[PDB]
Amino acid sequence: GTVNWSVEDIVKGINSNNLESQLQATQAARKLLSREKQPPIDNIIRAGLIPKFVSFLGKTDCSPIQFESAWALTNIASGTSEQTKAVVDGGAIPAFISLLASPHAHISEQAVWALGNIAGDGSAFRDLVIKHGAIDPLLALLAVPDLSTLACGYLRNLTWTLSNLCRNKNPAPPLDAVEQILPTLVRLLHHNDPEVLADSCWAISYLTDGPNERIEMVVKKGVVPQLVKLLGATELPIVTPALRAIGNIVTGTDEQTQKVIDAGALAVFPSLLTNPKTNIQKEATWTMSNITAGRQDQIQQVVNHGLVPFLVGVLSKADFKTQKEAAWAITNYTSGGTVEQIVYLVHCGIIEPLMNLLSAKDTKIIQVILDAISNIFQAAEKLGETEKLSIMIEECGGLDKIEALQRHENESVYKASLNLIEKYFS
Amino acid sequence: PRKVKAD
Amino acid sequence: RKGR
Secondary structure, three states, X not given: XXXXXXXXXXXXXXXXXXXXXXXXXXXXXXXXXXXXXXXXXXXXXXXXXXXXHHHHHOOOOOHHHHHHHXXXXXXXXXXXXXXXXXXXXXXXXXXXXXXXXXXXXHHHHXXXXXXXXXXXXXXXHHHHHHHOOOHHHHHHHOOOOOHHHOOHHHHHHHHHHHHHHOOOOOOOOOHHHHHHHHHHHHHHOOOOOHHHHHHHHHHHHHHOOOOHHHHHHHHHOOOHHHHHHHHOOOOHHHHHHXXXXXXXXXXXXXXXXXXXXXXXXHHHHHHHOOOOOHHHHHHHHHHHHHHXXXXXXXXXXXXXXXXXXXXXXXXXXXXHHHHHHHHHHHHHHHHHOOHHHHHHHHHOOOHXXXXXXXXXXXXXXXXXXXXXXXXXXXHHHXXXXXXXXXXXXXXXXXXXXXXXXXXXXXXXHHHHHHHHHHHHOO | OXXXXXX | XXXX
16 A cells, blocks of 8 residues: 555655645655665655655644654654754654644654654754753653553653653753653652663663762652662663662762662672673672772671672673773772771782782783782781781782783883882892 | 664 | 772
């Protein structure tokens, strides 16, 4: 019927003064744009069809052509930035927002989808969507006593579009828009649908990826215990954004970090730090590094949860990027910890896997490790057990690595290494 | 960031 | 000493 028309045939149908002919040709355009192998998006744009699709959005007396044109425009906006810009240039943003209140849920759902693609292109289009007034009618669609009464795909598309309004930086979304969206986000964060939960965590992920004042906005809503719960989910698409949000939060103040500890997030980290997914261990260890950069009582919580042997583990065997985050976690630990905590660190076996990583080509990790070497010796001087520490390194092949680093580029490596050998290896 | 509505 |  309308299967695999030529672009020229679609043009002649849209350019006819027959509404049913225009409807028939618009649907055929939609079918081309929704095909798997290559949608001829650029062919449809070059023929000048976007202004005509946009005009069909306003045909209130002909719902079907509203739907087909909305679907067609949605699929163009899902392409490149240039392609999305073409949809925006045709005036599609106000026309799509006007369709949010359509009595036809499938047309309103399509307008939600289209706005999601437009907002997701970048901060400029995101804020332009916001300026046109999309947030109020979007949130009104979720203003129900129970989210469970909404269609599954409809709620998922609303959640995904909202998360795009929370996404991107330079600039981050407007503060008042974040305040407006955020009570609905929190309600979506407690829904039972896994993908809704995933997109909700991504939205919180985006909102916490900024300065502490953005972070405070989110934590004042009390979402931290829910994020820790989602941190323990089995669905890996939930854990990944949940771990990101938790990691962004522990970049803020020690008080915001403390709320993550108080909510019980540290008990999940034995699993996360042995997680078979490389990125999860990798992200969990970075989060651990920002936790070990906190107060001594928060370092003590790491100790209490048995997490120091787990850091010894990732330092002994992990992906290199993960081992780099483990060194940072150790150096931060050794920088803010007590003598007892730094002593405990060596009793756990941190010295031997720390030496082994003095062989990697990365210049930064050697600086990071050597910083931690110094701090561990620094506590050994308060206990007079320095020489007894020095022999340990000599027996796991260490001094071979340090004294070799005395002849090494970037100087700063050689300075700390020669300084190291000068004081504790006489 | 974006999604095509397929059939 | 928190980073990103």
